[PDB]
Subunit: 241 residues, 2 copies
């Protein structure tokens, strides 16, 4: 069972142009994600899928591996599909390029989940959050069954607190592990109403009946979408030293 | 394929003490639900399940079949399990005792779905609603996939309207059809945190990986839960006789 990591890292960004190259305590963000991907055991290759020559140069300068991809993809998943046709693997792990506080051990948990059950199509992560936190539509909630399969991904606070002291909440951590066959059939899947209404691409998978198993991990460090959040990651990663 | 209908009828009610006996055009609500259940084709027997002798006498007075069940039951579905041990059937249909405007044709659609797919564990009903109607916690919402299977049920307005113009809402009609094996171990299913927080019995099935297929029907008549709606129901019900 060959497994590879692919890190979507487009140069463009609405809030932080050239995000991948932003310096964090001495190293460009994309490097922090790449080096940590390298600490994950059981993975044969780690790639940074980019669209700009500057990102590609930056990745090669610190020893990393980069692969150029179409500069008109609508999302990291669509770019991952392009990489799939080019890099042969049985399992592909999609790691966000703007989440440098990722924990290698967390990615191992994810991989183990795929290998312990070869029938599992997709796997992802999640961690506990308060009800106050679950109220934010910017934070995605996931509801799971006993086997930990996802029932639904929503920006609405679910489960609903009819009996609030009985409610337990979960934030979805955007890391994904995919079986090869799922990426091969991907471009054929139609966008679904829940997906367009919620603005949650993973819903496209649930629509088509493809199962996604979650795996709980401890609370995860913040991502880099805003200048404010960027200073947050710096202060955090620095002190971590 | 033997199919039977069981109508749970707990007496108590915070808002409407004794809903089942509440009169509607000269018939206890429970009668309207029973007579309509009798119009459903393909069903061999129709029972009413209660924990209160007052409801029991009321059903026998109009010549219906009534069975007494424990009072410690947590839900209607748990109550049907007790009935299951005594009343044999391949398929059990749980019809709410407080929705008198039920359409026999909709229950047949439900039964047809079970028979068309002998592998389907549970089937239920749903119908389109406005976003405004979906805001109410008392109205349960359901979100499905392309095979009409349910993804999740909630009192919360789902799907969340990030792009409000693309949100389409489906209201869950609380009628259920289950294979016998579903009930035989429904009361032995692990606790569902979602069930406990949302107070939705069907969530115990999802928590256990048991599939529930949805079937869309036309907008249904309101229910007798609030003194406000109870009047809308009498007006309509009487208007129907006309
Ligand atoms: N301990 C209990 C509680 C309820 N019931 C009976 O079960 C039926 C369904 O209950 P409901 O409370 O009116 O309806 C609910 C509700 O909460 O509105 C139950 C809930 O678990 C779930 O089945 C939703 C559906 O999602 C449809 O809304 O519907 C009623 O005839 C009620 O008397 C019972 O027998 N024993
Ligand atoms: N069109 C797109 C959109 C996002 N992505 C990647 O997906 C991740 C998260 O997306 P955001 O730009 O929205 O933060 C980033 O690593 C980003 O580079 C991509 O490679 N192509
Ligand atoms: Mg982002
Ligand atoms: Mg009701």
């Amino acid at each position: 069972s060959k497994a590879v990591i692919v890190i979507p890292a487009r140069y463009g960004s609405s809030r932080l142009p050239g995000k991948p190259l932003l310096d964090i305590v001495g190293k460009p963000m994309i490097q922090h994600v790449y080096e940590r991907a390298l600490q994950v055991a059981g993975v044969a290759e780690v790639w940074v899928a980019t669209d700009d020559p500057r990102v590609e140069q930056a990745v090669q300068a610190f020893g990393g591996k980069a692969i150029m991809t179409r500069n008109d993809h609508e999302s990291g998943t669509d770019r991952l599909v392009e990489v799939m046709h080019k890099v042969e693997a049985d399992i592909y792990i999609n790691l966000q390029g703007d989440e440098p506080m990722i924990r290698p051990r967390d990615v191992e948990t994810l991989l183990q989940g795929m290998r312990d059950d070869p029938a599992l199509p997709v796997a992802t992560l999640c961690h506990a959050i308060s009800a106050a936190e679950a109220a934010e539509p910017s934070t995605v909630k996931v509801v799971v069954n006993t086997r930990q399969d996802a029932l639904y991904f929503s920006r609405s606070p679910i489960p609903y607190p009819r009996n609030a002291e009985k409610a337990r909440y979960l934030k979805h951590v955007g890391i994904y592990a995919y079986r090869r066959d799922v990426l091969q059939n991907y471009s054929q899947l139609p966008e679904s109403m829940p997906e367009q209404a919620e603005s949650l691409e993973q819903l496209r998978l649930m629509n088509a009946g493809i199962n996604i198993r979650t795996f709980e991990v401890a609370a995860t460090g913040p991502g880099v979408d805003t200048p404010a959040c960027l200073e947050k990651v710096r202060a955090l990663m620095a002190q971590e030293l």
